[PDB]
Symmetry: D2
Subunit: 39 residues, 4 copies
Amino acid sequence: DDLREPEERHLDDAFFRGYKNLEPEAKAQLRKILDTFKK
Amino acid sequence: REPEERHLDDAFFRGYKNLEPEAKAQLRKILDTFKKD
Amino acid sequence: REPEERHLDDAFFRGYKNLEPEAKAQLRKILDTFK
Amino acid sequence: NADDLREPEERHLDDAFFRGYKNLEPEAKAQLRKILDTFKK
């Protein structure tokens, strides 16, 4: 069920860490931006 | 505050992981525009 | 669709010009990730 | 218009932004419009 290659999992975890280091206003903007990519 | 924070941040990551790979890649680049300096 | 394209492009530029400076700067950086 | 308060440097940055947008492919232009909408108050 999780077919991610190790590098992809690493980049996904780096993505979360980067998000969590954003100030709260930027985290909010990024959540809104995320939503524009949902299909 | 911690309740709604973790819910928003877990939903954010869940939605990220649900994106197709090319979208995930674009969102990583967009994240980096908030990080670079 | 040419009028529709022009309208959407002009609405985009108007909206960008109505943002505050730091947001205009952020949108420029985001555009750079698509080019 | 004649009421433009931007300095030429900002006008030039803005104009280059708009030319970069117009040079994108349609799918990307549409994605950028969606992103711009997220910055509206």
